[PDB]
Amino acid sequence: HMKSIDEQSLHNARRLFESGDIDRIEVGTTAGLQQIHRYLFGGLYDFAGQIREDNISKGGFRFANAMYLKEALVKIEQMPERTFEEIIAKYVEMNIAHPFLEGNGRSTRIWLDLVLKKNLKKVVNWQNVSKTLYLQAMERSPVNDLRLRFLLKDNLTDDVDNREIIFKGIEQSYYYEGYEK
Amino acid sequence: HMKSIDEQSLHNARRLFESGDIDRIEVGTTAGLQQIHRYLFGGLYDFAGQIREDNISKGGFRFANAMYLKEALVKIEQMPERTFEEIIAKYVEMNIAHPFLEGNGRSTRIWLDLVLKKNLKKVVNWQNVSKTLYLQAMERSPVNDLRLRFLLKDNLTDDVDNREIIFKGIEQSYYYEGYEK
Ligand SMILES: [Cl-]
Ligand SMILES: [Cl-]
Ligand SMILES: [Cl-]
Ligand SMILES: [Cl-]
Ligand SMILES: [Cl-]
């Protein structure tokens, strides 16, 4: 049956890695996140790669106000990346920014892995990070990022070029957002 | 017994009105909010009137990141004030900003009343706004400000210079934050 947006986007994510285009993206910047988003969602959402102008929320949580989102992103992208703790803090702020109308979670997890890979030579082995534990750690993270830090730290891998880790991690990441083939 | 910080601050709030200094403050601006805060807390908190550099949270809610708080405040203070709906929206954003380490609620409710008074010739009759209903409306407000809008609209008064409304409203406002003589 015709591919859904999420299914085609998962194919786009796989291609991002298969083609090597993943490693030609800016790391740790707003523009690099936009690049990822455009690769994942170009042709699928008209706003692929575009910073939102509208406010968004999920549950009882409102993401950063569009009114000062661009200003926030400039500060976020200048945050340091030299330790695991710093990188998670930067990720937590980029999640709070949530700069697109859709596709924030999936694009920003790829973004995080590029920052980890560049600075620590590690990535998250997402296939081993449960959806329930991830989502609860993310919900806690604005106030206290310790649960998220430990969850991700416990699931780091140095096998950053392994196909199975990459592809199973894409699958897991998309499953966090509700998609399973 | 020696006055507490909250007790002396309540006296400062009363004096702000008794002296007429209330009506010599900028309305609807960050600087005007700082002015209120300095009047309420000067001599009590070393940070009276000062924009925080640290992050703060209450419950599972983190207020705007200090990292981009100044940038946020510039946008917030430029929000329009010509309708009740606009004024509540501006207030909701200033509450999310929560720009001081302490004293945000009390200072920002005075700030709100000055905006209402200037633009609508009304203020909130806080003595009639229950603490429980206020706090639940405020908790909902980042996502949906309708409950807050209706609660405050239902409690507006045109008797903006009435001593009892003013002084009982200060008392109620301080009680929202836990202080009762
Ligand atoms: Cl930090
Ligand atoms: Cl997503
Ligand atoms: Cl925020
Ligand atoms: Cl608005
Ligand atoms: Cl307060």
Short mmCIF file of C-alpha atoms and ligand atoms in Angstrom, two decimals:
data_model
loop_
_atom_site.label_atom_id
_atom_site.label_comp_id
_atom_site.label_asym_id
_atom_site.label_seq_id
_atom_site.Cartn_x
_atom_site.Cartn_y
_atom_site.Cartn_z
CA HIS A 1 0.00 0.00 0.00
CA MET A 2 1.05 3.58 -0.57
CA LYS A 3 3.76 4.64 1.84
CA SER A 4 2.68 6.87 4.67
CA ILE A 5 4.60 10.04 5.48
CA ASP A 6 6.27 8.27 8.38
CA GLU A 7 7.19 5.23 6.29
CA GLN A 8 8.71 7.27 3.47
CA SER A 9 10.48 9.42 6.04
CA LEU A 10 12.04 6.30 7.58
CA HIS A 11 13.31 5.39 4.11
CA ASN A 12 14.72 8.93 3.84
CA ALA A 13 16.50 8.46 7.18
CA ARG A 14 18.05 5.22 5.99
CA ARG A 15 19.19 6.90 2.80
CA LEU A 16 20.69 9.78 4.76
CA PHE A 17 23.10 7.23 6.24
CA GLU A 18 23.52 4.90 3.22
CA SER A 19 24.49 7.77 0.95
CA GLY A 20 27.03 9.25 3.35
CA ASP A 21 25.09 12.53 3.33
CA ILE A 22 24.81 12.24 7.14
CA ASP A 23 28.51 13.12 7.50
CA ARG A 24 28.31 16.17 5.23
CA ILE A 25 25.86 18.04 7.60
CA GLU A 26 26.91 20.73 10.03
CA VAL A 27 27.17 19.24 13.54
CA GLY A 28 25.53 20.81 16.56
CA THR A 29 23.99 23.84 14.87
CA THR A 30 20.52 25.03 14.04
CA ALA A 31 21.35 24.87 10.33
CA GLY A 32 22.52 21.29 10.72
CA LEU A 33 19.24 20.35 12.41
CA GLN A 34 17.37 22.03 9.55
CA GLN A 35 19.46 20.04 7.09
CA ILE A 36 18.49 16.77 8.81
CA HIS A 37 14.84 17.78 8.87
CA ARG A 38 14.87 18.63 5.18
CA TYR A 39 16.36 15.24 4.38
CA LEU A 40 13.86 13.37 6.52
CA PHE A 41 10.74 15.30 5.52
CA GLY A 42 11.44 16.99 2.19
CA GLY A 43 8.65 16.07 -0.20
CA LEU A 44 6.47 14.99 2.73
CA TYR A 45 5.82 18.16 4.75
CA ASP A 46 5.77 21.59 3.07
CA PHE A 47 7.61 23.02 6.09
CA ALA A 48 10.56 20.62 5.84
CA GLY A 49 13.63 22.36 7.18
CA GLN A 50 11.71 25.51 8.15
CA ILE A 51 11.65 27.11 11.60
CA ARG A 52 8.04 27.37 12.75
CA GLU A 53 6.16 30.63 13.25
CA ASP A 54 3.32 29.01 15.24
CA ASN A 55 3.24 27.72 18.76
CA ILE A 56 2.98 24.01 19.49
CA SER A 57 2.32 21.90 22.53
CA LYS A 58 1.98 18.23 23.52
CA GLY A 59 0.20 17.22 26.66
CA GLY A 60 0.31 20.09 29.10
CA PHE A 61 3.79 21.12 27.73
CA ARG A 62 4.25 24.14 25.51
CA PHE A 63 7.47 24.26 23.51
CA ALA A 64 9.46 27.48 23.23
CA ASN A 65 7.37 30.41 22.08
CA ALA A 66 7.70 31.08 18.35
CA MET A 67 7.97 34.71 19.25
CA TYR A 68 11.53 34.26 20.61
CA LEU A 69 12.38 30.86 19.08
CA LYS A 70 14.95 32.20 16.63
CA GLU A 71 16.67 34.05 19.46
CA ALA A 72 16.63 30.89 21.58
CA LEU A 73 18.13 28.82 18.76
CA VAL A 74 21.06 31.22 18.39
CA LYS A 75 21.90 30.70 22.06
CA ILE A 76 21.29 26.94 21.97
CA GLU A 77 23.57 26.30 19.02
CA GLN A 78 26.43 28.17 20.79
CA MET A 79 26.25 25.85 23.83
CA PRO A 80 29.43 23.81 24.36
CA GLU A 81 29.81 20.14 23.41
CA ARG A 82 32.97 18.91 25.14
CA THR A 83 31.49 16.59 27.71
CA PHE A 84 28.59 14.16 27.78
CA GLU A 85 26.87 16.33 30.36
CA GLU A 86 27.21 19.44 28.17
CA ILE A 87 25.95 17.57 25.11
CA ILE A 88 22.86 16.30 26.92
CA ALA A 89 22.18 19.77 28.27
CA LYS A 90 22.38 21.16 24.72
CA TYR A 91 20.05 18.41 23.48
CA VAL A 92 17.55 19.12 26.28
CA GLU A 93 17.44 22.77 25.21
CA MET A 94 17.03 21.87 21.53
CA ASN A 95 14.15 19.56 22.48
CA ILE A 96 12.49 22.40 24.43
CA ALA A 97 12.95 24.61 21.35
CA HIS A 98 11.21 21.99 19.18
CA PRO A 99 11.67 24.28 16.18
CA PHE A 100 9.56 22.55 13.52
CA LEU A 101 5.80 21.92 13.33
CA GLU A 102 6.44 18.16 13.19
CA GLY A 103 9.46 15.87 13.10
CA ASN A 104 11.36 17.38 16.04
CA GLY A 105 11.99 14.18 17.93
CA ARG A 106 13.35 12.15 15.05
CA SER A 107 15.48 14.93 13.53
CA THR A 108 16.89 16.02 16.89
CA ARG A 109 17.91 12.47 17.92
CA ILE A 110 20.00 12.20 14.71
CA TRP A 111 21.38 15.67 15.53
CA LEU A 112 22.31 14.51 19.04
CA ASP A 113 24.10 11.43 17.72
CA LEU A 114 26.22 13.57 15.38
CA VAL A 115 27.28 15.74 18.34
CA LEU A 116 28.10 12.66 20.43
CA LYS A 117 30.00 11.10 17.53
CA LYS A 118 32.06 14.23 16.81
CA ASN A 119 32.97 15.00 20.41
CA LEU A 120 32.99 11.60 22.15
CA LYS A 121 33.23 9.05 19.31
CA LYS A 122 30.03 7.46 20.62
CA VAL A 123 26.36 7.34 19.64
CA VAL A 124 23.23 6.22 21.46
CA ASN A 125 22.28 2.56 20.86
CA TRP A 126 18.61 3.54 20.63
CA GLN A 127 17.34 0.00 19.99
CA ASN A 128 18.14 -0.73 23.66
CA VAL A 129 16.51 2.43 25.04
CA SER A 130 12.88 1.67 25.86
CA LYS A 131 10.19 4.01 24.60
CA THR A 132 8.61 4.28 28.06
CA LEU A 133 11.87 5.07 29.82
CA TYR A 134 12.90 7.54 27.08
CA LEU A 135 9.64 9.42 27.16
CA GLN A 136 9.62 9.70 30.97
CA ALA A 137 13.20 10.88 31.00
CA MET A 138 12.40 13.47 28.35
CA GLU A 139 9.35 14.69 30.34
CA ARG A 140 11.53 15.19 33.42
CA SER A 141 14.41 16.79 31.51
CA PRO A 142 13.47 20.52 31.58
CA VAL A 143 13.54 20.42 35.35
CA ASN A 144 16.15 17.76 35.91
CA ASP A 145 18.09 15.98 33.17
CA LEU A 146 19.69 13.36 35.41
CA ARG A 147 17.33 10.53 34.46
CA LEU A 148 17.90 11.25 30.75
CA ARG A 149 21.65 11.56 31.21
CA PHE A 150 21.94 8.19 32.91
CA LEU A 151 19.57 6.46 30.50
CA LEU A 152 21.51 7.62 27.47
CA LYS A 153 24.95 7.18 29.08
CA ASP A 154 24.08 3.55 29.89
CA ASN A 155 23.23 2.99 26.22
CA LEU A 156 26.19 4.63 24.49
CA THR A 157 28.21 2.63 21.96
CA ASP A 158 31.57 3.21 20.35
CA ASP A 159 30.49 1.15 17.31
CA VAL A 160 29.35 4.27 15.54
CA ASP A 161 29.58 2.96 11.97
CA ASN A 162 27.68 -0.30 12.54
CA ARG A 163 24.79 -0.76 10.15
CA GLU A 164 22.58 -2.73 12.51
CA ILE A 165 22.95 -0.19 15.32
CA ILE A 166 22.16 2.64 12.93
CA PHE A 167 19.19 1.03 11.19
CA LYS A 168 17.66 -0.51 14.34
CA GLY A 169 18.13 2.87 16.03
CA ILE A 170 16.22 4.65 13.24
CA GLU A 171 13.45 2.10 13.65
CA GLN A 172 13.36 2.67 17.41
CA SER A 173 13.42 6.45 17.02
CA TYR A 174 10.45 6.36 14.64
CA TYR A 175 8.63 3.99 17.03
CA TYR A 176 9.03 6.60 19.80
CA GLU A 177 6.78 8.81 17.68
CA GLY A 178 4.20 6.08 16.99
CA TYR A 179 5.35 4.51 13.73
CA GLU A 180 5.95 0.79 13.33
CA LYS A 181 5.88 -0.91 9.97
CA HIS B 1 7.65 39.73 66.25
CA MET B 2 10.15 40.80 63.63
CA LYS B 3 8.53 41.17 60.24
CA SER B 4 9.20 38.41 57.76
CA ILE B 5 10.31 39.22 54.22
CA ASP B 6 6.79 38.56 52.99
CA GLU B 7 5.20 40.72 55.68
CA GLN B 8 7.49 43.68 55.06
CA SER B 9 7.01 43.22 51.33
CA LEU B 10 3.23 43.43 51.79
CA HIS B 11 3.78 46.72 53.63
CA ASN B 12 5.92 47.85 50.69
CA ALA B 13 3.10 46.94 48.29
CA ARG B 14 0.63 48.97 50.31
CA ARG B 15 3.01 51.92 50.32
CA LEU B 16 3.49 51.65 46.57
CA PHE B 17 -0.20 52.50 46.25
CA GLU B 18 -0.57 54.90 49.22
CA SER B 19 2.29 57.07 48.04
CA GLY B 20 1.06 57.31 44.45
CA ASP B 21 4.34 55.79 43.26
CA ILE B 22 2.31 53.04 41.54
CA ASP B 23 1.18 55.52 38.87
CA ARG B 24 4.68 56.82 38.15
CA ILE B 25 5.93 53.36 36.87
CA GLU B 26 6.22 52.45 33.22
CA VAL B 27 3.21 50.32 32.19
CA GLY B 28 3.55 47.04 30.34
CA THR B 29 7.33 46.95 30.02
CA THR B 30 10.14 44.90 31.44
CA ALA B 31 11.56 48.01 33.12
CA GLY B 32 8.19 48.71 34.71
CA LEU B 33 8.06 45.17 36.10
CA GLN B 34 11.58 45.65 37.48
CA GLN B 35 10.45 48.90 39.07
CA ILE B 36 7.57 47.12 40.83
CA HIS B 37 9.87 44.34 41.98
CA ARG B 38 12.37 46.81 43.39
CA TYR B 39 9.62 48.54 45.33
CA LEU B 40 8.22 45.30 46.70
CA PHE B 41 11.52 43.61 47.55
CA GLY B 42 14.17 46.31 47.85
CA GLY B 43 15.92 45.86 51.18
CA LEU B 44 14.57 42.31 51.43
CA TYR B 45 16.18 40.40 48.55
CA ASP B 46 19.60 41.40 47.19
CA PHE B 47 18.33 40.70 43.66
CA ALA B 48 15.39 43.12 43.90
CA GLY B 49 14.66 44.46 40.44
CA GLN B 50 17.33 42.30 38.79
CA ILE B 51 16.79 39.90 35.89
CA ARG B 52 17.97 36.45 36.93
CA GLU B 53 20.94 34.63 35.44
CA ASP B 54 19.97 31.23 36.90
CA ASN B 55 17.24 28.85 35.91
CA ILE B 56 14.22 28.26 38.13
CA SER B 57 11.40 25.80 38.24
CA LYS B 58 8.32 24.97 40.35
CA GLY B 59 6.74 21.57 40.23
CA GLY B 60 7.57 19.95 36.93
CA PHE B 61 7.53 23.42 35.21
CA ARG B 62 10.70 25.17 34.15
CA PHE B 63 10.41 28.89 33.51
CA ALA B 64 12.08 30.48 30.49
CA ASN B 65 15.75 29.62 30.21
CA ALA B 66 18.01 32.35 31.60
CA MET B 67 20.12 31.84 28.55
CA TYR B 68 17.55 33.59 26.31
CA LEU B 69 15.43 35.33 28.97
CA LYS B 70 16.57 38.84 28.08
CA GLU B 71 15.74 38.18 24.44
CA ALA B 72 12.34 36.81 25.44
CA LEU B 73 11.59 39.87 27.58
CA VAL B 74 12.29 42.23 24.67
CA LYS B 75 9.66 40.40 22.61
CA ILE B 76 7.18 40.11 25.49
CA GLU B 77 7.22 43.80 26.35
CA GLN B 78 6.47 44.68 22.68
CA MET B 79 3.27 42.57 22.69
CA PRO B 80 0.09 44.63 22.14
CA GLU B 81 -2.30 45.64 24.92
CA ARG B 82 -5.47 46.86 23.20
CA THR B 83 -7.86 44.11 24.12
CA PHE B 84 -8.44 41.97 27.19
CA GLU B 85 -7.40 38.91 25.22
CA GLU B 86 -4.12 40.54 24.15
CA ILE B 87 -3.40 41.71 27.69
CA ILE B 88 -3.93 38.23 29.15
CA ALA B 89 -1.74 36.74 26.44
CA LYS B 90 1.02 39.22 27.32
CA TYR B 91 0.62 38.41 31.03
CA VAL B 92 0.80 34.66 30.31
CA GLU B 93 4.10 35.19 28.50
CA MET B 94 5.49 37.38 31.29
CA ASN B 95 4.55 34.67 33.81
CA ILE B 96 6.38 32.06 31.70
CA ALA B 97 9.39 34.40 31.64
CA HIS B 98 9.31 34.63 35.46
CA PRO B 99 12.34 36.92 35.30
CA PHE B 100 13.33 37.18 38.98
CA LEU B 101 14.60 34.53 41.41
CA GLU B 102 11.60 35.20 43.69
CA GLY B 103 8.63 37.57 43.72
CA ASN B 104 7.43 36.96 40.16
CA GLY B 105 3.82 36.25 40.97
CA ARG B 106 3.19 39.24 43.18
CA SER B 107 5.10 41.76 41.05
CA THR B 108 3.58 40.54 37.79
CA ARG B 109 -0.02 40.69 39.09
CA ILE B 110 0.51 44.40 39.93
CA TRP B 111 2.06 44.79 36.46
CA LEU B 112 -1.00 43.16 34.88
CA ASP B 113 -3.39 45.45 36.74
CA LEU B 114 -1.52 48.53 35.49
CA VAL B 115 -1.88 47.28 31.89
CA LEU B 116 -5.59 46.57 32.41
CA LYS B 117 -6.09 49.96 34.05
CA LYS B 118 -4.30 51.89 31.29
CA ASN B 119 -5.96 50.14 28.36
CA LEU B 120 -9.38 49.07 29.69
CA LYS B 121 -9.93 51.22 32.81
CA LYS B 122 -10.39 48.01 34.80
CA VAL B 123 -8.37 45.94 37.29
CA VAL B 124 -8.78 42.43 38.65
CA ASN B 125 -10.77 42.22 41.91
CA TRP B 126 -8.34 39.63 43.25
CA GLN B 127 -10.08 39.21 46.61
CA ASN B 128 -12.85 37.37 44.72
CA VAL B 129 -10.49 35.15 42.69
CA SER B 130 -9.90 31.93 44.61
CA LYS B 131 -6.35 30.71 45.09
CA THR B 132 -7.24 27.21 43.86
CA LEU B 133 -8.96 28.44 40.72
CA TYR B 134 -6.18 30.97 40.01
CA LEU B 135 -3.41 28.45 40.37
CA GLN B 136 -5.13 25.87 38.14
CA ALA B 137 -5.83 28.48 35.51
CA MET B 138 -2.21 29.59 35.61
CA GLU B 139 -1.00 25.97 35.28
CA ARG B 140 -3.14 25.51 32.17
CA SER B 141 -2.23 28.88 30.66
CA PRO B 142 0.91 28.04 28.60
CA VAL B 143 -1.12 25.57 26.60
CA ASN B 144 -4.52 27.20 26.74
CA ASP B 145 -5.28 30.52 28.42
CA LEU B 146 -9.06 30.27 28.16
CA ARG B 147 -9.65 29.24 31.77
CA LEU B 148 -7.47 32.13 32.99
CA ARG B 149 -9.10 34.59 30.62
CA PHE B 150 -12.60 33.76 31.81
CA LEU B 151 -11.62 33.65 35.49
CA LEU B 152 -10.05 37.10 35.35
CA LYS B 153 -12.71 38.58 33.02
CA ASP B 154 -15.43 37.49 35.46
CA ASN B 155 -13.61 39.33 38.25
CA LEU B 156 -12.79 42.65 36.57
CA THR B 157 -13.86 45.89 38.25
CA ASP B 158 -14.07 49.45 37.01
CA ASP B 159 -13.58 50.73 40.58
CA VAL B 160 -9.87 50.99 40.03
CA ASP B 161 -9.11 53.59 42.72
CA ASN B 162 -11.00 51.88 45.56
CA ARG B 163 -8.86 51.35 48.63
CA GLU B 164 -10.57 48.18 49.81
CA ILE B 165 -10.29 46.51 46.40
CA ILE B 166 -6.61 47.45 46.20
CA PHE B 167 -5.63 46.45 49.73
CA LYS B 168 -7.72 43.25 49.84
CA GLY B 169 -6.28 42.37 46.43
CA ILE B 170 -2.71 42.78 47.71
CA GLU B 171 -3.60 40.52 50.61
CA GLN B 172 -5.05 37.92 48.25
CA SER B 173 -2.08 38.12 45.91
CA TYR B 174 0.36 37.52 48.76
CA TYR B 175 -1.82 34.63 49.98
CA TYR B 176 -1.47 32.99 46.54
CA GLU B 177 2.22 32.69 47.35
CA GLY B 178 1.67 31.31 50.87
CA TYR B 179 1.67 34.39 53.09
CA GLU B 180 -1.15 35.20 55.50
CA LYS B 181 -0.67 37.44 58.48
CL CL C 1 24.16 23.96 30.71
CL CL C 2 9.34 13.55 15.47
CL CL C 3 9.92 27.85 27.64
CL CL C 4 -0.74 36.47 21.31
CL CL C 5 5.75 35.94 44.06
#
